[PDB]
Design a protein around this ligand. Structure first.
Ligand SMILES: CC(C)S(=O)(=O)NC[C@H](C)c1ccc(-c2ccc([C@@H](C)CNS(=O)(=O)C(C)C)cc2)cc1
Ligand SMILES: C=C(C)[C@H]1CN[C@H](C(=O)O)[C@H]1CC(=O)O
Length: 262
């Protein structure tokens, strides 16, 4: 018999956010955003009931080198705590080895956020100077990209970042953004282009994304390996793409009510 599907996700604007009047509400109704709408669409097209839950440890999914335990949403999937993850979860080799990803539902790449006026146009620009500090989230796919890169510029950047004092790493998107905004052009933040483009359209309208992306990848919906949900979820993602629903949802949550003009 069908059993209610436990969705693991995480608060990250505009993917999942607490409604302002969330306290008056209950269950799935508490939340709003791109991934909330997407979960509704997937569930509709797969014929399942579901429960949105916020990941306990606030993490996306990494493996501890010593203990080999997976944390975050990937962890919830691997250890049987959740049946599906619907979040801006980057498709990576290390994650795909232990869970299944759908086809991607959104494209992104690592990108550069600056406070307007910062004299930086590219990663190379960043790598060749020291006056403007720059960094990434303290863990996640961006940091791993830098840690593992053999590309000259990116190698030089990682070498700088891992040793910079005080730390150039941040714990949350909100923190990286606040640091850009409050550092008077002396901090640039390396983050996924999706969040970058989102932030650029929000007041106080004092940041921007500069240069091309450093890589090209996607977010995927994740299921435990061998789940019966894998195939229908994947097909649902293809369908939503082809029906224009993914485009409509990204417009809805990024641009339709952009706050920095046209
Ligand atoms: C991690 C990498 C292997 S990757 O991200 O999967 N691909 C790398 C390559 C550069 C790339 C990167 C991103 C995309 C890409 C293209 C489209 C989309 C959305 C809009 C729809 N995805 S879909 O699979 O094409 C669709 C028909 C459902 C999402 C991601 C396609 C290819
Ligand atoms: C917001 C976080 C911590 C997530 C979102 N996608 C990446 C991931 O799935 O690891 C992380 C961002 C990043 O690494 O820039």
């Amino acid at each position: 018999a069908n059993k209610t599907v436990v969705v693991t996700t995480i608060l990250e604007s505009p993917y999942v956010m607490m409604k302002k009047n969330h306290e008056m509400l209950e269950g799935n109704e508490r939340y709003e955003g791109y991934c909330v709408d997407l979960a509704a669409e997937i569930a509709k097209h797969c014929g399942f009931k579901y429960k949105l839950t916020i990941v306990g440890d606030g993490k996306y999914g990494a493996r501890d080198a010593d203990t080999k335990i997976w944390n975050g949403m990937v962890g919830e999937l691997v250890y049987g705590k959740a049946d599906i993850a619907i979040a801006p979860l980057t498709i990576t080799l290390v994650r795909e080895e232990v869970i299944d990803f759908s086809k991607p539902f959104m494209s992104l790449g690592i990108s550069i956020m600056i406070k307007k006026g910062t004299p930086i146009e590219s990663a190379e620009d960043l790598s060749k100077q020291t006056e403007i500090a720059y960094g990434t989230l303290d863990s996640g796919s961006t940091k791993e990209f830098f840690r593992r890169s053999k590309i000259a510029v990116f190698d030089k950047m990682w070498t700088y970042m891992r040793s910079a004092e005080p730390s150039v790493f941040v714990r949350t998107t909100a923190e990286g953004v606040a640091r850009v905004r409050k550092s008077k052009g002396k901090y640039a933040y390396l983050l996924e282009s999706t969040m970058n483009e989102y932030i650029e359209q929000r007041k106080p309208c004092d940041t921007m994304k500069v240069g091309g992306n450093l890589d090209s990848k996607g977010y995927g919906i994740a299921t435990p390996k061998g789940s019966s949900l894998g195939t229908p979820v994947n097909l649902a993602v293809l369908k939503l793409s082809e029906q224009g629903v993914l485009d409509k949802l990204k417009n809805k949550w990024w641009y339709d009510k952009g706050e920095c003009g046209s």
